């Protein structure tokens, strides 16, 4: 029997010279079961759901601030940072952003003057929408996913972006005015950050890597990268993951771990486990020396990596479930952070707090 979460070092202090230590969560869990482990561990949140575009505008000009809300008391209350995640985003987006003046989607518009004013009114939705929004969080974020996953998996276009609703109406500006607009409402001292997964893999790095510093010769205020690290036991390597963060790095720009999470499995995550019972120590075993390697990367590149954010707390919430689930016929558990469902430590734990 493993002790309990607040039975033993905390990871926060750990890396207290390093860089933070970060959850995900949802305003259900900032009660007393989930919130005895994150005051314990973590010096940073971030809303694993509440802040998404969606999740606070769902209609134009009505607003819906109260997940948002109480995940910023409990920052404050609780002295931890805040990264924003996220400003714009292809998914958890709402359909009026996308509709011309007539109501009608202004992908489906031909006459190109017309698309010139779609793309037009589009780009000042979205500024107001981050205007709003960084007006009333400012003073709490410590660092903001300005966009998320704004570079495709493939090369559908010679810079590998992702062609979204918000590419196929104003190519890369969406991308420069959600930075222009966080630059100007936040200050010049919030930490803007562009936010990927894959962010070790080739080709997608380099059209990443591309676009970023396409950017900055242009003056778009970027101060660093968000990598995801959706990640498994033996992929990617942690040489591909050294040499990306080293190469972002190269540019000035910092790193940031955004939503870190260690599956039992590989991609598609099949076959799963059924139940968390039902898999074997041996993989969480390999899980412990997957973290031993990740995190002693880390801590060599804590000149160059300021937060280290888990995408959720303990092993009894995870959207790696829903993919589990996805690919075994509705049958799936994974296993990704360093404490078990009951907030138990895992061999895991013990592998980094040494
Ligand atoms: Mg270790
Ligand atoms: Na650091």
Not at 142 to 169: F, H, K, M
Not at 172 to 193: N, Q, S
Not at 220 to 248: C, K, L, N, Y
Request: glycine share 6%.
């Amino acid at each position: 029997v493993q002790p309990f979460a607040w039975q033993v070092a905390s990871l926060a202090d750990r890396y207290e010279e390093s860089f933070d230590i970060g959850a995900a969560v949802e305003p259900h869990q900032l009660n007393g079961r989930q919130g005895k482990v994150l005051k314990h561990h973590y010096n940073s949140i971030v809303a694993e759901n509440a802040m998404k575009p969606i999740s606070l505008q769902p209609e134009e000009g009505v607003f819906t601030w109260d997940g948002a809300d109480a995940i910023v008391e409990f920052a404050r209350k609780n002295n931890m940072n805040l990264r924003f995640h996220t400003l714009v985003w292809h998914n958890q987006v709402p359909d009026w952003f996308f509709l011309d003046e007539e109501g009608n989607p202004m992908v489906e518009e031909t006459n190109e003057a017309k698309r010139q004013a779609n793309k037009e009114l589009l780009l000042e939705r979205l500024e107001t929408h981050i205007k709003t929004v960084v007006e009333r969080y400012k003073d709490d974020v410590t660092a903001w996913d300005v966009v998320n996953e704004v570079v495709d998996d493939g090369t559908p276009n010679e810079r590998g972006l992702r062609e979204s609703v918000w590419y196929q109406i104003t190519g890369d500006e969406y991308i420069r005015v959600a930075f222009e607009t966080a630059r100007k409402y936040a200050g010049e001292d919030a930490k803007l950050f562009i936010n990927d997964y894959n962010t070790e893999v080739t080709p997608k790095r380099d059209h990443l890597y591309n676009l970023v510093q396409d950017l900055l010769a242009d003056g778009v205020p970027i101060d660093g990268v968000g990598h995801q690290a959706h990640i498994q036991i033996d992929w990617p390597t942690i040489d591909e993951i050294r040499t990306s963060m080293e190469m972002f790095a190269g540019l000035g720009l910092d790193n940031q771990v955004t939503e870190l999470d260690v599956s039992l499995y590989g991609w598609p995550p099949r076959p799963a486990f059924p139940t968390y019972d039902a898999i074997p120590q041996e993989r969480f075993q390999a899980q412990a020396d997957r973290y031993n390697q990740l995190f002693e990367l880390y801590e060599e590149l804590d000149a160059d990596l300021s937060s280290v954010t888990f995408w959720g707390i303990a092993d009894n919430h995870t959207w790696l479930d829903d993919r589990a689930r996805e690919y075994n016929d509705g049958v799936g558990k994974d296993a990704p952070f360093v404490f078990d469902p009951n907030a138990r430590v895992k061999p895991a734990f013990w592998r980094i707090i040494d």
